[PDB]
Amino acid sequence: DEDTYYLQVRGRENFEILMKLKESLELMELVPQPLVDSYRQQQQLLQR
Amino acid sequence: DEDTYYLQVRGRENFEILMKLKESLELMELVPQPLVDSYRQQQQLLQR
Amino acid sequence: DEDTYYLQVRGRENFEILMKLKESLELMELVPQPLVDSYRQQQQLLQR
Amino acid sequence: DEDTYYLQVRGRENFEILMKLKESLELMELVPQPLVDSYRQQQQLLQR
Numbered sequence: 001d002e003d004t005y006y007l008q009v010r011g012r013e014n015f016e017i018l019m020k021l022k023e024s025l026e027l028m029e030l031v032p033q034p035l036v037d038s039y040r041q042q043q044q045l046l047q048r
Numbered sequence: 049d050e051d052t053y054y055l056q057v058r059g060r061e062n063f064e065i066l067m068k069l070k071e072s073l074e075l076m077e078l079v080p081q082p083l084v085d086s087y088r089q090q091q092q093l094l095q096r
Numbered sequence: 097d098e099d100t101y102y103l104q105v106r107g108r109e110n111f112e113i114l115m116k117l118k119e120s121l122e123l124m125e126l127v128p129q130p131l132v133d134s135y136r137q138q139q140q141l142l143q144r
Numbered sequence: 145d146e147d148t149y150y151l152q153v154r155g156r157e158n159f160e161i162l163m164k165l166k167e168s169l170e171l172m173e174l175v176p177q178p179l180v181d182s183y184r185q186q187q188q189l190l191q192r
Contacts, residue, residue: 002059004058006055006144006192007055008053008054008055009073009074012049013116014073014074015055017116018055020109020113022062023183024169025066025168026062026187027172027180028168029058031175043170053191054144056190056191061164065161071136072120072121073117075120075123075124075127075132079126084123087122087126088119091119095115096102098159100152100153101152101159102150102151103150103151103159104148105148105149105169106148107170109169110169110170113165113169114151114165118162121158121162122155
């Protein structure tokens, strides 16, 4: 139990923010791991 | 068309982040407007 | 170490989605617990 | 004005949800456009 799930979200504004996020989170699995690591490094520089 | 929607999210980690968010976004409608305005002020102080 | 944090987000679209979310998540602490429980119940009805 | 921004988020749980999201949203720019389009198609199948 960890595959696709259904998220009931009320309100267009709310749905859109999460929908774009669902795409960002889901797509993060389709981005080459080595390329994500590099980004994490650029981000590791400063969380500010 | 702006009521509750269904968001298919794959991966437990992904689902949990959005699920907690769905709750935060949805609940934001149940928090007294005047009280949210006050918070926005405290937040308006600095986005840093 | 769990108070306010700084999140560096690149891209306006990205910043806005998270900013509105920061407000939703942060405000969730300002909404009466008993009132949130009631919502969670309405949400507990179905995650679909 | 649309580059990196700073998001002040209070509470570890809150910060973590948005932080992982900041990474997902930001990384979405590093994932080949043609590959994202394919995903969007798989997602276009059903929003349920």
